Amino acid sequence: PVIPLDPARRPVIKAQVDTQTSHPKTIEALLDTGADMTVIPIALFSSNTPLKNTSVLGAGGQTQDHFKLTSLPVLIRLPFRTTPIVLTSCLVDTKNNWAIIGRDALQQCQGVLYLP
Amino acid sequence: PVIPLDPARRPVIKAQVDTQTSHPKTIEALLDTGADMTVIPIALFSSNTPLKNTSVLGAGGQTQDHFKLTSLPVLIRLPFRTTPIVLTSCLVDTKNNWAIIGRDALQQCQGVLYLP
Numbered sequence: 001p002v003i004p005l006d007p008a009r010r011p012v013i014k015a016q017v018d019t020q021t022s023h024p025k026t027i028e029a030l031l032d033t034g035a036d037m038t039v040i041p042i043a044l045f046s047s048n049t050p051l052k053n054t055s056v057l058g059a060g061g062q063t064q065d066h067f068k069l070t071s072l073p074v075l076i077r078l079p080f081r082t083t084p085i086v087l088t089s090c091l092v093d094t095k096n097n098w099a100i101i102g103r104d105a106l107q108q109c110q111g112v113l114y115l116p
Numbered sequence: 117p118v119i120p121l122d123p124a125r126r127p128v129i130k131a132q133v134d135t136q137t138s139h140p141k142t143i144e145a146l147l148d149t150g151a152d153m154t155v156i157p158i159a160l161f162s163s164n165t166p167l168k169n170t171s172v173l174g175a176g177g178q179t180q181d182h183f184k185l186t187s188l189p190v191l192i193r194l195p196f197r198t199t200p201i202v203l204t205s206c207l208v209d210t211k212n213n214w215a216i217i218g219r220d221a222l223q224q225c226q227g228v229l230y231l232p
């Protein structure tokens with residue numbers, strides 16, 4: 001679909017996310033052309049799963065271990081798509097439990113930004 | 117135009133930004149559906165101009181005084197638009213010197229995100 005853009009209403013969608021470490025779960029995610037890489041909440045995992053450490057530039061500065069990287073691919077199913085998006089790896093938010101769909105995922109839908 | 121989305125290439129545009137506190141300048145700005153409010157580099161203002169304090173949602177944590185708010189409106193002109201975008205207020209980057217076109221401005225462009 002077409003997603004209108006408004007400062008007052010964040011552009012979110014419901015996504016079924018499969019980390020391959022528990023059953024798939026539906027989350028509400030921010031669609032974000034300024035994010036290079038998708039971010040999913042640590043709440044989707046088991047607390048026995050291995051993650052890798054990572055650096056990331058952010059809007060508050062540069063932090064230590066706020067974000068981790070998944071070891072296995074993550075599959076994401078959108079309501080309007082038959083096929084899952086398969087991300088070889090994506091970021092994991094161990095604090096705020098943000099859910100952000102980034103350009104790695106939007107490229108696989110062939111999503112585009114259109115300014116008339 | 118149509119702007120394809122790619123994890124490896126940031127969706128950027130050239131925009132002429134008028135802070136009304138110095139002469140207008142063309143800068144390169146990131147097109148960002150995840151930003152509620154447009155962000156302008158402090159370099160575009162005069163060093164005699166008043167800005168106000170405020171907090172901002174950001175990655176890596178919470179940024180008290182990284183970002184300030186403008187006192188006067190900001191006008192933005194795009195390559196394909198004669199008429200300016202008028203932002204009654206927008207964020208100012210006093211450090212990393214980022215330029216981000218947020219949803220306040222994309223709404224006046226009639227910009228949209230399209231997922232096939």
Ligand SMILES: CCC(CC)CN(C[C@@H](O)[C@H](Cc1ccccc1)NC(=O)O[C@H]1CO[C@H]2OCC[C@H]21)S(=O)(=O)c1ccc(N)cc1
Nearest residue numbers: 034035036037057058059148150151152153173174175218
């Ligand atoms: C410099 C912005 C960077 C580009 C390198 C990208 N950000 C996306 C941003 O859209 C983020 C996404 C975000 C949205 C809401 C709450 C937390 C994060 N929010 C944000 O910083 O925008 C702020 C400025 O406008 C204001 O309105 C919304 C927040 C304010 S991010 O959160 O720090 C981010 C950076 C890299 C990856 N791989 C994933 C996410």
